[PDB]
Amino acid sequence: SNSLPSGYRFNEFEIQEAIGEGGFGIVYRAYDHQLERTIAIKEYMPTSLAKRNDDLSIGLRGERFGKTFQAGLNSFIQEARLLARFSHPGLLHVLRFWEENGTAYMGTQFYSGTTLKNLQAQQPEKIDEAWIRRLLPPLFSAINTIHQEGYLHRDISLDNIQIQESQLPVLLDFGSARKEIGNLSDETEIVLKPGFAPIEQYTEQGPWTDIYALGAVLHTLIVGSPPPVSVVRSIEDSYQPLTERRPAGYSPELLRTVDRALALKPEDRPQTIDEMAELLEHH
Ligand SMILES: Nc1ncnc2c1ncn2[C@@H]1O[C@H](COP(=O)(O)OP(=O)(O)OP(=O)(O)O)[C@@H](O)[C@H]1O
Numbered sequence: 001s002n003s004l005p006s007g008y009r010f011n012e013f014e015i016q017e018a019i020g021e022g023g024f025g026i027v028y029r030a031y032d033h034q035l036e037r038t039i040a041i042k043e044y045m046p047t048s049l050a051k052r053n054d055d056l057s058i059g060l061r062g063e064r065f066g067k068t069f070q071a072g073l074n075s076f077i078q079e080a081r082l083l084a085r086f087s088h089p090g091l092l093h094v095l096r097f098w099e100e101n102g103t104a105y106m107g108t109q110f111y112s113g114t115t116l117k118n119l120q121a122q123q124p125e126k127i128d129e130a131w132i133r134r135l136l137p138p139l140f141s142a143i144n145t146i147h148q149e150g151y152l153h154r155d156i157s158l159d160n161i162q163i164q165e166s167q168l169p170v171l172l173d174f175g176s177a178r179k180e181i182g183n184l185s186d187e188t189e190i191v192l193k194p195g196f197a198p199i200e201q202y203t204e205q206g207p208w209t210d211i212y213a214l215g216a217v218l219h220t221l222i223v224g225s226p227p228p229v230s231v232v233r234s235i236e237d238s239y240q241p242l243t244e245r246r247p248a249g250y251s252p253e254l255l256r257t258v259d260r261a262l263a264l265k266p267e268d269r270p271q272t273i274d275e276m277a278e279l280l281e282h283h
């Protein structure tokens with residue numbers, strides 16, 4: 001809708017197709033004619049704040065949006081810098097960054113496959129316990145790599161995990177610009193992800209914060225929907241443990257691991273990714 005057309009050029013880069021269009025950015029499949037390789041280009045584009053001009057630059061929808069637009073842009077830059085710290089198969093690899101068209105762009109590695117959200121919607125029968133147990137070692141590795149450098153993800157759900165055709169996962173996006181815009185605009189609904197964010201994110205954060213969201217992802221894969229919103233749980237905890245529900249085809253060991261990651265209070269969860277991984281052993 002707002003996307004650059006196939007054939008658009010950024011010097012050596014050529015746009016091939018808009019493959020993702022959300023409220024806050026566009027993702028393109030593109031081609032580097034100098035290195036003769038396919039890449040992705042992520043374009044900052046907050047549709048509530050900005051529109052596409054005739055010359056294909058980006059312009060404010062209203063002059064009052066300039067401060068929030070710039071703050072989102074700054075957060076987009078900071079996220080690119082964070083991802084540029086890593087060279088890990090499970091984290092989105094950043095090749096280049098530049099500003100143009102009144103906005104900003106990340107050139108990144110192009111990944112095969114699709115999101116975990118799309119895989120769960122389109123092929124849920126592929127997702128069983130054996131598949132989940134193959135997913136977890138590389139997913140654990142990617143998350144732990146963030147933690148070991150002193151950072152947290154804080155936006156994990158099914159929507160921003162890529163599942164490659166190899167089935168290996170990639171963490172694509174931390175939602176930084178979206179969340180900054182939401183906080184400044186009082187659009188609270190775009191900051192935290194209901195059912196994935198644990199209680200301490202609503203206002204003490206650490207690796208256990210991401211571990212809860214990973215538990216919520218796993219819960220969604222096993223029974224089809226995330227657990228109750230954590231603030232609602234903090235009033236009256238209506239979470240039914242998976243070890244009691246006993247969904248068909250799932251071991252108590254995997255179920256219990258998910259339940260422990262979803263402990264309401266941070267101190268009751270696995271405290272590190274390594275601690276959570278240890279729970280899946282002894283079987
Ligand atoms: N580096 C990358 N390589 C390949 N694909 C990517 C990359 N980064 C993001 N994507 C894809 O971009 C899309 C971003 O999803 P978003 O919700 O913004 O767009 P969408 O138009 O709703 O896409 P979808 O087809 O997933 O519904 C996802 O389909 C994701 O797989």
Ligand SMILES: [Mn+2]
Pocket residue numbers: none
């Ligand atoms: Mn979609």
